[PDB]
PDB file of C-alpha atoms in Angstrom:
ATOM      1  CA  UNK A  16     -17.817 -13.255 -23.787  1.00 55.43           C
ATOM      2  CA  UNK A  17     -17.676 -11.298 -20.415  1.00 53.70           C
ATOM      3  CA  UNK A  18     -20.819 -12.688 -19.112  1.00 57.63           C
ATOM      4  CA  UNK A  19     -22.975 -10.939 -15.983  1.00 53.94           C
ATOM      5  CA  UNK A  20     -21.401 -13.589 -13.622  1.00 52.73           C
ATOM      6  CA  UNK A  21     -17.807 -14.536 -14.293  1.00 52.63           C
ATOM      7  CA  UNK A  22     -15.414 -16.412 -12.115  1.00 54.43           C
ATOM      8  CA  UNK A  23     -11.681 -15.937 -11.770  1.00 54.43           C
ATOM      9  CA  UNK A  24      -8.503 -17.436 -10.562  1.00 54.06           C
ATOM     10  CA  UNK A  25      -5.068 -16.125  -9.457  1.00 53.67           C
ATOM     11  CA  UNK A  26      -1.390 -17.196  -8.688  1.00 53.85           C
ATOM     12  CA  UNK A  27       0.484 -14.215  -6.836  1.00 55.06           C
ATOM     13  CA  UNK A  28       4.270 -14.530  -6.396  1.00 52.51           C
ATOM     14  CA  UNK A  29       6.794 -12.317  -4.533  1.00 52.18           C
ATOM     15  CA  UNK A  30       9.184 -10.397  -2.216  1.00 50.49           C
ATOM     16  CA  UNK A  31       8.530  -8.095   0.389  1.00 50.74           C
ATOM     17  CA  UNK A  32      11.694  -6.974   2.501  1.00 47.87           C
ATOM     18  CA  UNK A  33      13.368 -10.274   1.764  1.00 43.49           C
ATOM     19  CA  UNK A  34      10.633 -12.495   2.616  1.00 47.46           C
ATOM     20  CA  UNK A  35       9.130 -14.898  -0.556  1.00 47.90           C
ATOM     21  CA  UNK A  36       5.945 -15.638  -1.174  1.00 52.13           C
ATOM     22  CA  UNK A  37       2.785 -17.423  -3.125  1.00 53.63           C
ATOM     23  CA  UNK A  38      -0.696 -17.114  -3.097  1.00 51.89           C
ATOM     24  CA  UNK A  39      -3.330 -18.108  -5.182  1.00 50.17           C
ATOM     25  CA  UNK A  40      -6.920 -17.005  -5.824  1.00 52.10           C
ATOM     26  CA  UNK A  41     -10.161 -17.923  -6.732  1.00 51.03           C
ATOM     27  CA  UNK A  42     -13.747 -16.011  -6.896  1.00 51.12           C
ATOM     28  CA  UNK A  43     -16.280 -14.399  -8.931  1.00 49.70           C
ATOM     29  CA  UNK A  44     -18.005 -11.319  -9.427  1.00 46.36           C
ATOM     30  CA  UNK A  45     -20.667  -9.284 -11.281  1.00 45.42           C
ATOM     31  CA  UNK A  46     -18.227  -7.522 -14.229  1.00 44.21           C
ATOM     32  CA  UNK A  47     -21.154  -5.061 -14.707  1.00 45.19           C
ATOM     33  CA  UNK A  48     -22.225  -3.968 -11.881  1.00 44.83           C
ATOM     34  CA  UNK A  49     -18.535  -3.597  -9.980  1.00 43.82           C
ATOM     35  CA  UNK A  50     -18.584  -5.858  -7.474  1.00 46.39           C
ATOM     36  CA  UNK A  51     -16.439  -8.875  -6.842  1.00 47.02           C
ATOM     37  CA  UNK A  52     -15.208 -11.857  -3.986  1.00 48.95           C
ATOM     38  CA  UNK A  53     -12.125 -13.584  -3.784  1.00 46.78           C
ATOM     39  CA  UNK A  54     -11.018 -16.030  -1.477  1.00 48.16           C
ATOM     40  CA  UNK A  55      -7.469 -16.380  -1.263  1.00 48.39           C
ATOM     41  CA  UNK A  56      -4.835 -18.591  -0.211  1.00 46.13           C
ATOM     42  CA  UNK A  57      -1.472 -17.940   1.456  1.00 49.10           C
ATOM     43  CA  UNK A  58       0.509 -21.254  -0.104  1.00 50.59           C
ATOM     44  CA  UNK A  59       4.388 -20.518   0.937  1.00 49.09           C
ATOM     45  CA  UNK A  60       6.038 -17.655   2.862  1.00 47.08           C
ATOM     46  CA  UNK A  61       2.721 -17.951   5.561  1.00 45.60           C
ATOM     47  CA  UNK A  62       2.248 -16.524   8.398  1.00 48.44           C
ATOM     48  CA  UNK A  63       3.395 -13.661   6.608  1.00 46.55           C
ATOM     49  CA  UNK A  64       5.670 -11.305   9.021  1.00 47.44           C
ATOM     50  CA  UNK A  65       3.716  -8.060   7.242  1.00 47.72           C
ATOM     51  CA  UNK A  66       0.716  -6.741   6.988  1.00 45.14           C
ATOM     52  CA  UNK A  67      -1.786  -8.495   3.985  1.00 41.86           C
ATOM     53  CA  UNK A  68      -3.157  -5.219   3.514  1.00 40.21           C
ATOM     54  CA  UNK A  69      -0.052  -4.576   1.382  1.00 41.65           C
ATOM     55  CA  UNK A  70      -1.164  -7.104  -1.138  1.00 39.13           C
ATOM     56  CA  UNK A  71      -5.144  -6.200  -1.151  1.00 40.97           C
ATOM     57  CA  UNK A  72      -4.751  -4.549  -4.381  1.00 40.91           C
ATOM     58  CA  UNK A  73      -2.994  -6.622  -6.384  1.00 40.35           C
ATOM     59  CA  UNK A  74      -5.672  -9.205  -6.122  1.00 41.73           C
ATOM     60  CA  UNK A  76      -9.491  -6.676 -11.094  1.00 39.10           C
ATOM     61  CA  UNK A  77     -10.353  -4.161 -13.483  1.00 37.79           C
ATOM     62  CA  UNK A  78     -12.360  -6.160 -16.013  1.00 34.98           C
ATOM     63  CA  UNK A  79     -15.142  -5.720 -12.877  1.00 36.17           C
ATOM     64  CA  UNK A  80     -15.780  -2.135 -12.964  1.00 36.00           C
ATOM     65  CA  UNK A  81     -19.009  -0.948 -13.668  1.00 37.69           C
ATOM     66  CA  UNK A  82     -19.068   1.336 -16.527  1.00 40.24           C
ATOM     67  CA  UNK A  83     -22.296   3.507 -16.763  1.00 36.17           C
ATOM     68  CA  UNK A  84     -22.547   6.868 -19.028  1.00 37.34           C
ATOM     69  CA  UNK A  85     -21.523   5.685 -22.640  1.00 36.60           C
ATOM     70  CA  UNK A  86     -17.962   6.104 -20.891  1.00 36.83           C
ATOM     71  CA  UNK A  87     -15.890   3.341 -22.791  1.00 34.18           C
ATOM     72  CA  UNK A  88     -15.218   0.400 -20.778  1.00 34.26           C
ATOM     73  CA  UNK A  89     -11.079  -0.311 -22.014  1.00 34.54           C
ATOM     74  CA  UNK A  90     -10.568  -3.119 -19.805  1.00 38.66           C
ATOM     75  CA  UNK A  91     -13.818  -5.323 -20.970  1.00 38.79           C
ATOM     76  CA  UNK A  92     -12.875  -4.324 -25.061  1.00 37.29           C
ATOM     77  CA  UNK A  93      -9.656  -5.640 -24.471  1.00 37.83           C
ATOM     78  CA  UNK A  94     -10.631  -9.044 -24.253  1.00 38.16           C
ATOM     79  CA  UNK A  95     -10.394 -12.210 -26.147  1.00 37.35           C
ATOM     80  CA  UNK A  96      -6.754 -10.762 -26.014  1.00 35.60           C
ATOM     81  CA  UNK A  97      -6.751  -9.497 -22.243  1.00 35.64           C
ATOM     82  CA  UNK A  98      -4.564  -6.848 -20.914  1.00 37.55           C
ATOM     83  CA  UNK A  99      -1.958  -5.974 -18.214  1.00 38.24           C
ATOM     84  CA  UNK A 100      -1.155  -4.244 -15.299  1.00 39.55           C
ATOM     85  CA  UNK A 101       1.790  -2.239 -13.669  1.00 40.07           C
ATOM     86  CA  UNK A 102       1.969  -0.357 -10.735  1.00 41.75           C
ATOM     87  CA  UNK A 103       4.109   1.240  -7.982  1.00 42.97           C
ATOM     88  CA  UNK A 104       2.639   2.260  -4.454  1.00 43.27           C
ATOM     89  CA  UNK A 105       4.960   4.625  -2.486  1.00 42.99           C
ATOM     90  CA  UNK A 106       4.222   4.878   1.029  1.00 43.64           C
ATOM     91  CA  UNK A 107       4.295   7.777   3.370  1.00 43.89           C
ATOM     92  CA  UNK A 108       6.663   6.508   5.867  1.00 43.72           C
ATOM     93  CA  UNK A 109       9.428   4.993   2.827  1.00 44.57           C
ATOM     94  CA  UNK A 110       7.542   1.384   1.913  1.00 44.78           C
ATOM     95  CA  UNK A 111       7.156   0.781  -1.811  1.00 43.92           C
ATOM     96  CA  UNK A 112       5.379  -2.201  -3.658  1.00 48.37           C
ATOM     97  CA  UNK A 113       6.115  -2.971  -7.182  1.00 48.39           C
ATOM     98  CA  UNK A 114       3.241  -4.975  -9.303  1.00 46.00           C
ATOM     99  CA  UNK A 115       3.397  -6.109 -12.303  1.00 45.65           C
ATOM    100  CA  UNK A 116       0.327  -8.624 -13.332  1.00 48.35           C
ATOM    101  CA  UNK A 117      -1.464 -10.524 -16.765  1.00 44.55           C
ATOM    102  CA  UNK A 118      -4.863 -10.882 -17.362  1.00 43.21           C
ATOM    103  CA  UNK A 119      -5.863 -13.338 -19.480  1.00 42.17           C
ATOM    104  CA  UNK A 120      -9.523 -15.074 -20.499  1.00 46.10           C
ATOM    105  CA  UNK A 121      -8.535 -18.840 -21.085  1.00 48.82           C
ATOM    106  CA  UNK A 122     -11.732 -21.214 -21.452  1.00 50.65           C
ATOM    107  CA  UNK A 123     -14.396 -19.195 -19.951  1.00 49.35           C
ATOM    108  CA  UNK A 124     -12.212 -18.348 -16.926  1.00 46.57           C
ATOM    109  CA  UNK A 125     -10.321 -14.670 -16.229  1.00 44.10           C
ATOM    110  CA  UNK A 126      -6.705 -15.817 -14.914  1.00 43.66           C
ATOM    111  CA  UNK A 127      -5.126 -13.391 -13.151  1.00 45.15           C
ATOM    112  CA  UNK A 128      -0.786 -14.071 -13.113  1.00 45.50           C
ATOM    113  CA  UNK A 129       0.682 -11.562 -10.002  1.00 46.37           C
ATOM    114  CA  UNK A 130       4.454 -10.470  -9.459  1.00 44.21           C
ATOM    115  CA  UNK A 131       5.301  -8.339  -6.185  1.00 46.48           C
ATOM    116  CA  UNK A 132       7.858  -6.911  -5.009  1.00 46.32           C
ATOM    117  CA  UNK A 133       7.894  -4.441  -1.806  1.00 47.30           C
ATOM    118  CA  UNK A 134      11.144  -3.167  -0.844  1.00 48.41           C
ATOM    119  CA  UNK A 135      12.235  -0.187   1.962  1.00 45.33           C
ATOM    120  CA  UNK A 136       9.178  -1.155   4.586  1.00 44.84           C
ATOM    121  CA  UNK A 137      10.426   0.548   7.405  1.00 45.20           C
ATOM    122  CA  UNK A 138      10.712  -2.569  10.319  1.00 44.72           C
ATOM    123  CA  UNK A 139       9.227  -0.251  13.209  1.00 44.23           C
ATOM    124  CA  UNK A 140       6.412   0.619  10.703  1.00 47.79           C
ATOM    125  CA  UNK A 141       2.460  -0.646  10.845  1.00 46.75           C
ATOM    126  CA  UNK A 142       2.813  -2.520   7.974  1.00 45.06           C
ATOM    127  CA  UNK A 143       5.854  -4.876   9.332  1.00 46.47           C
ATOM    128  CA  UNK A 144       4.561  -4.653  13.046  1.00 44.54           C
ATOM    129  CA  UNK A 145       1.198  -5.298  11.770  1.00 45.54           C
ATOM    130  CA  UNK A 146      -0.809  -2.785  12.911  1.00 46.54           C
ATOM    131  CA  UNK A 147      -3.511  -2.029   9.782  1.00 44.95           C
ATOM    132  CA  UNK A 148      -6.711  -2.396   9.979  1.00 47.30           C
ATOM    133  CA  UNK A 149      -7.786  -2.094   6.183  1.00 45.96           C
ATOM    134  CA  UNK A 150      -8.288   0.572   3.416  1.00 46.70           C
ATOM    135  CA  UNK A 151     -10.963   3.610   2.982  1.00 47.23           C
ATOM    136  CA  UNK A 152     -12.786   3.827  -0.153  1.00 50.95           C
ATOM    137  CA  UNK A 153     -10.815   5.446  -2.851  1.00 49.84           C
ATOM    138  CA  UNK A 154     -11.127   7.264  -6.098  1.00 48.94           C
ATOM    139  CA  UNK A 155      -8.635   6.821  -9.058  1.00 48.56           C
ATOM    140  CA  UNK A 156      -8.717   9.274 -11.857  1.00 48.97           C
ATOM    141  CA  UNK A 157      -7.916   7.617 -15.400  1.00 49.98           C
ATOM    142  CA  UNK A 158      -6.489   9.032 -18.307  1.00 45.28           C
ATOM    143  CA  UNK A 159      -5.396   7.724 -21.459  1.00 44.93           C
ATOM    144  CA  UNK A 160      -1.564   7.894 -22.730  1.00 46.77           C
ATOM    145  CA  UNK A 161       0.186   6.239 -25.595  1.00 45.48           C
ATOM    146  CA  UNK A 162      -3.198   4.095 -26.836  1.00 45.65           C
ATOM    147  CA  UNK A 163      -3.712   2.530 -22.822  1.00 46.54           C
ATOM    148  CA  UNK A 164      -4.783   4.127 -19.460  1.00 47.34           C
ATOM    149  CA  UNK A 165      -2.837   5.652 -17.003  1.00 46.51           C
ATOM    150  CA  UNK A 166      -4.080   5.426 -13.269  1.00 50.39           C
ATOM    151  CA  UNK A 167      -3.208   7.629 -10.223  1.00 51.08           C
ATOM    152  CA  UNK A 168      -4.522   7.083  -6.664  1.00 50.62           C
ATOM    153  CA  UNK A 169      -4.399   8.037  -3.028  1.00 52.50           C
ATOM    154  CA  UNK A 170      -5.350   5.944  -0.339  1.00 50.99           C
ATOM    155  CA  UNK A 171      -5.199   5.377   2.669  1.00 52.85           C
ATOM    156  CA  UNK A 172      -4.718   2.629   5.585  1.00 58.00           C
ATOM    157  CA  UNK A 173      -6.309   2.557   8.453  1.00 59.59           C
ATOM    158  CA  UNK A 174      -3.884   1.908  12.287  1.00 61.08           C
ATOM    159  CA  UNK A 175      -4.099   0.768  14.985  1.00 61.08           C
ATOM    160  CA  UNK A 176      -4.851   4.033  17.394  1.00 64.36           C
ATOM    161  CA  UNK A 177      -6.661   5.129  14.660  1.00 64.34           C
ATOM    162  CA  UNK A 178      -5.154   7.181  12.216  1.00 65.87           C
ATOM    163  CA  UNK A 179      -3.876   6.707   8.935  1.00 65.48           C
ATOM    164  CA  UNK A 180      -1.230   5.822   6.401  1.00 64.72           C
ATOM    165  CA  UNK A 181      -1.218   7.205   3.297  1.00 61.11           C
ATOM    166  CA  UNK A 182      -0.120   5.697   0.075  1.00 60.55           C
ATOM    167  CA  UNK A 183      -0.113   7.174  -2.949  1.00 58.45           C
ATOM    168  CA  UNK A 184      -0.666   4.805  -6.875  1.00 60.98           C
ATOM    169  CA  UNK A 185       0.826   5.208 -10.257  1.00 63.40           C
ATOM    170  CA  UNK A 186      -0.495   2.640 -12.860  1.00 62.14           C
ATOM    171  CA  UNK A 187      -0.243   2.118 -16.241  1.00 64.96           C
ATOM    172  CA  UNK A 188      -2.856  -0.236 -18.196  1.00 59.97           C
ATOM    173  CA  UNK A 189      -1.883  -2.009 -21.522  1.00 60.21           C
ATOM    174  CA  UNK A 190      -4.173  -3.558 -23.957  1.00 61.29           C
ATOM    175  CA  UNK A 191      -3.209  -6.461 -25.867  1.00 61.16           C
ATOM    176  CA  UNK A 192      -5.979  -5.601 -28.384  1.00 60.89           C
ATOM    177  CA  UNK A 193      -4.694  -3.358 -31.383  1.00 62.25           C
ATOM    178  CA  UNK A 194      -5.831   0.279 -31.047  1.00 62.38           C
ATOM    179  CA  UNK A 195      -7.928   0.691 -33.717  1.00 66.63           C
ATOM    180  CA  UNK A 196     -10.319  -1.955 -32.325  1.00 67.63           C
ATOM    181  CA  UNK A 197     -10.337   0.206 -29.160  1.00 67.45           C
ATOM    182  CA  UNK A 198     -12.481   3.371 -28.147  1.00 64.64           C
ATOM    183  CA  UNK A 199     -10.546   5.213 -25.561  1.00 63.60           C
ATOM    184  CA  UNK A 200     -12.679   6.942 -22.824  1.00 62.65           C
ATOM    185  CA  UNK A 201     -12.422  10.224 -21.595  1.00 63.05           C
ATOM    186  CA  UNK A 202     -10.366  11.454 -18.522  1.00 59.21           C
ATOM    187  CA  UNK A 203     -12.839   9.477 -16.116  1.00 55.29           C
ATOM    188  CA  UNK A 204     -12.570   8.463 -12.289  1.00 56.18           C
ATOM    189  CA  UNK A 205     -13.412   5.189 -10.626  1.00 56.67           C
ATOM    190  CA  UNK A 206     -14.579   5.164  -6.821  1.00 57.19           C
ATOM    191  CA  UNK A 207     -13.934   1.981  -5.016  1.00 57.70           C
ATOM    192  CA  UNK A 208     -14.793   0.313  -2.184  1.00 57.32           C
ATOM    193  CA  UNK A 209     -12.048  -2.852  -0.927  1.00 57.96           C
ATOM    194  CA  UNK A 210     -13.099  -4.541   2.251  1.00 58.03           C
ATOM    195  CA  UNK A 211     -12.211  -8.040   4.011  1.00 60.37           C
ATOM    196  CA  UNK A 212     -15.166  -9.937   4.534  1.00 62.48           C
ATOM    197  CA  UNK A 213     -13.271 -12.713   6.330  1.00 63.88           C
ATOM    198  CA  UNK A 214      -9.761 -13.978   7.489  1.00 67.97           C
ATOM    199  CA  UNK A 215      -8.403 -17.289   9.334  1.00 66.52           C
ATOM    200  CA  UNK A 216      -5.205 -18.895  10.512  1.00 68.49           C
ATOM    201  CA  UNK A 217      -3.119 -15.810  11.365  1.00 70.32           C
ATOM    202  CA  UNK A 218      -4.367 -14.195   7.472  1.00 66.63           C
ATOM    203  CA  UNK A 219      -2.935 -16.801   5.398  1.00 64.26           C
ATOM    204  CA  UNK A 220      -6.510 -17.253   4.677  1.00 65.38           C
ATOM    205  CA  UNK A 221      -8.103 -14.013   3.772  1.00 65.68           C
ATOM    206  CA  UNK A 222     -11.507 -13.369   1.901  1.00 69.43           C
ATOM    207  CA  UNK A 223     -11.526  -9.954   0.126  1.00 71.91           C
ATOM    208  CA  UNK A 224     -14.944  -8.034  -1.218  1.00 71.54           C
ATOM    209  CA  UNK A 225     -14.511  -4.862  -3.876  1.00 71.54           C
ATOM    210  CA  UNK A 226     -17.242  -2.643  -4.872  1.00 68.39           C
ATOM    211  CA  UNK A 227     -16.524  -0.195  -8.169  1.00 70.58           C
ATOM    212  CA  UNK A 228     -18.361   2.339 -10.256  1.00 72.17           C
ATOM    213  CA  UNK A 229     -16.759   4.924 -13.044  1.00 72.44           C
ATOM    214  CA  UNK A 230     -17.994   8.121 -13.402  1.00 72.42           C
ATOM    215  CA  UNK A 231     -17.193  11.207 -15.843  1.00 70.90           C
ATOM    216  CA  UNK A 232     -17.669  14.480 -13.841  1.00 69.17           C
ATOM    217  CA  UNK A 233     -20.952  14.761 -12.776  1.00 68.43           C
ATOM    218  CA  UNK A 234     -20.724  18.594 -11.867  1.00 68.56           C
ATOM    219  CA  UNK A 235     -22.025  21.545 -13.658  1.00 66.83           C
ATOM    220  CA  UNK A 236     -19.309  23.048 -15.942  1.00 66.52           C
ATOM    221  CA  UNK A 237     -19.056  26.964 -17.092  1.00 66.06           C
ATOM    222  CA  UNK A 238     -17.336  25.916 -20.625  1.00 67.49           C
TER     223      UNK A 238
END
């Protein structure tokens, strides 16, 4: 049912400082072994007047590669699926709202995307566009109320080098009953997101993630 190679597709709507939106999505990955392409289309609202590194994460958790016994959540949710939520606060006052679907329909993961960024300061890298893409990243998960709750820092690289920091608080959903679900452990996921490719002043933009969990691979005292 989630096969070694799976494909997926995506339609992304929203609003960042006023300015509407679409996208849509399609790629495929290795669900087992973390990694993932998607190729993705700017439909309406291009050439966006922001920075598309904004949006790189709310293009996948079903491709996560899930090693020591540690309960994959996001693969038993499915034939059902699950969602996403999320708010990223950045440094300088920017925040992005997410709230997304995941859904298996016919062999195919569909992936359904609302956005909304609000506060992006206009004299800021983001709306100047001056990013140059993320560093890897580590999210700690840990389970609340029968899902997953996700925290993250990351940051984006500028233009003079440097960085902007943003900081992540998710919240994962299963549409799967809990008692059909084995909840991991506190566990952390370190990730990799890089652009492979871009075109046409990034309304075309081809996108390349890398993930592995872990449970704390250091010597405890306890």
């Amino acid at each position: 049912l989630i096969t070694e190679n799976m494909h997926m597709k995506l339609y992304m709507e929203g609003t960042v400082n006023n300015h509407h939106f679409k996208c849509t999505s399609e790629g495929e990955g290795k669900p087992y072994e973390g990694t993932q392409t998607m190729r993705i289309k700017v439909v309406e609202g291009g050439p966006l007047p922001f920075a598309f590194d904004i949006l790189a994460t709310s293009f996948s958790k079903t491709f996560i590669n899930h090693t020591q016994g540690i309960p994959d959540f996001f693969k038993q949710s499915f034939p059902e699926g699950f969602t996403w939520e999320r708010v990223t606060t950045y440094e300088d006052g920017g925040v992005l709202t997410a709230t997304q679907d995941t859904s298996l329909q016919d062999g195919c993961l569909i992936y359904n995307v609302k956005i909304r960024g609000v506060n992006f300061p206009s004299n800021g890298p983001v709306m100047q566009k001056k990013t140059l893409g993320w560093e890897a990243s580590t999210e700690m998960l840990y389970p609340a109320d029968g899902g997953l709750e996700g925290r993250s820092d990351m940051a984006l690289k500028l233009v003079g080098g440097g960085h902007l920091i943003c900081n992540l608080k998710t919240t994962y959903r299963s549409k799967k009953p809990a008692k059909n679900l084995k909840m991991p452990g506190v566990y952390y996921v370190d990730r990799r997101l890089e652009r492979i490719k871009e075109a046409d002043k990034e309304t075309y933009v081809e996108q390349h993630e890398v993930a592995v969990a872990r449970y704390c691979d250091l010597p405890s005292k306890l």
